[PDB]
């Protein structure tokens, strides 16, 4: 699973 939106890296 992911952990957030790409703009949160």
């Amino acid at each position: 699973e992911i952990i957030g939106d790409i703009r949160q890296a």
Partner: antibody
Amino acid sequence: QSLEESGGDLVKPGASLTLTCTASGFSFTNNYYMCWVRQAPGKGLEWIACIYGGGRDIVFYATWAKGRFTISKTSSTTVTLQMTSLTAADTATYFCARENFDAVGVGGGTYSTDYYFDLWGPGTLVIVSS
Amino acid sequence: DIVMTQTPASVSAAVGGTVTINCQASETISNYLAWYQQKPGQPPKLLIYKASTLASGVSSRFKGSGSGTEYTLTISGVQCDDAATYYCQQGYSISDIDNSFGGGTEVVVKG
């Protein structure tokens, strides 16, 4: 694989309302976001909120939405949108939509991007009027 | 906040001709751009995603192109069944944005 919104209704200004999207022929998994997109009569599409089909709690709101609307998973086949402090500007058809994403990686964790909607309900009508 | 601007707001095309719709993004979106067609009383139908990938079961008369900040939708062999409203939709981010859809373009088919 389909969707059916419900809960739409005629309500007074200031009222709250909860809409429900019910999935069939599939169930929410870490592959999708489940989303609400609305559209006021004669106007454009307006994105509202997404919630992660996966197990982790991840929610995104449009900036006009956060604080007034709440998206949630109430089961693996149902997502709700709670609306509060409704005004006539909230009169719209409300669509439930499944959202695709690619999980790109960055240094240490994966992130979602490349969002598009591949599945929509026919909508439920919310009408706010005195 | 990534603001999708579509132009023109409306456009005409004679039957058999070609129509182009434009989408502009306030910032680069890495070709994460989707195009939908909506007919009255219906939910939108996905046409194109990843800027240029034609969705399954959609007419190849629909072409998505462009990159960076400027995208395009080109309908070739325009037909009456095409009269609809078209939307572009940036798929780069759902964090910190107002709307992912552009304002949409009305396509009128001159028969």
